[PDB]
Amino acid sequence: TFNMELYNTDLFLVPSPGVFSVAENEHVYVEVSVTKADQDLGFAIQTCFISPYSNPDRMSDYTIIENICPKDDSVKFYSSKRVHFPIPHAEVDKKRFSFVFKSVFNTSLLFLHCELTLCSRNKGSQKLPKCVTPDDACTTFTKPLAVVLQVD
């Protein structure tokens, strides 16, 4: 129901076939996606950080996005993409951003941890947070996802 894809270009055409290889100073194109029936339901990208653990309890000082705000300055957002399944009555909501990688760990095997927050895409709604955009954000309904990175 939730996805996280890495791509080699800002066309998000061709996802990497497992473990993404990355060197300092390169871009990484992330795509996150929610697949759902409700059409009032959106999401935002709450937090993203790199870390050498498959574990997020040991969070990390390498934070890219925090409370929907871009903390790393290399970060760019791209158009979001709602794509309809006609016959299954479904919608994939996708969001996209890049950043420039910096190696700073003591190891070559890393994790991109992103967490999605679900939210309500229509005004007047106790039931979940209304929705908000990334620099608008600079001014339980949350899902953790991890993808693997390989430094060279």
Swiss-Prot record:
Lineage: superkingdom: Eukaryota
Entry-listed glycosylation sites: 106
Intrachain disulfide bonds: 48-114, 69-138, 119-131
Gene ablation phenotype (knockout): Tgfbr3 deletion in mice is embryonic lethal at E14.5 due to failed coronary vessel formation associated with decreased epicardial cell invasion. Gonadotrope-specific knockout females are supra-fertile with enhanced folliculogenesis, numbers of ovulated eggs per cycle and litter sizes relative to control mice. Double knockout females for TGFBR3L and gonadotrope-specific TGFBR3 are infertile. They have increased serum follicle-stimulating hormone (FSH), pituitary protein content relative to controls. They have larger ovaries with increased numbers of antral follicles and corpora lutea.
PTM comment text: Extensively modified by glycosaminoglycan groups (GAG).
Cell location: Cell membrane; Secreted; Secreted, Extracellular space, Extracellular matrix
Function: Cell surface receptor that regulates diverse cellular processes including cell proliferation, differentiation, migration, and apoptosis. Initiates BMP, inhibin, and TGF-beta signaling pathways by interacting with different ligands including TGFB1, BMP2, BMP5, BMP7 or GDF5. Alternatively, acts as a cell surface coreceptor for BMP ligands, serving to enhance ligand binding by differentially regulating BMPR1A/ALK3 and BMPR1B/ALK6 receptor trafficking. Promotes epithelial cell adhesion, focal adhesion formation and integrin signaling during epithelial cell spreading on fibronectin.
Protein name: Transforming growth factor beta receptor type 3
Organism: Mus musculus
Phylogenetic placement of the source organism: Eukaryota, Metazoa, Chordata, Craniata, Vertebrata
Gene responsible for this protein: Tgfbr3
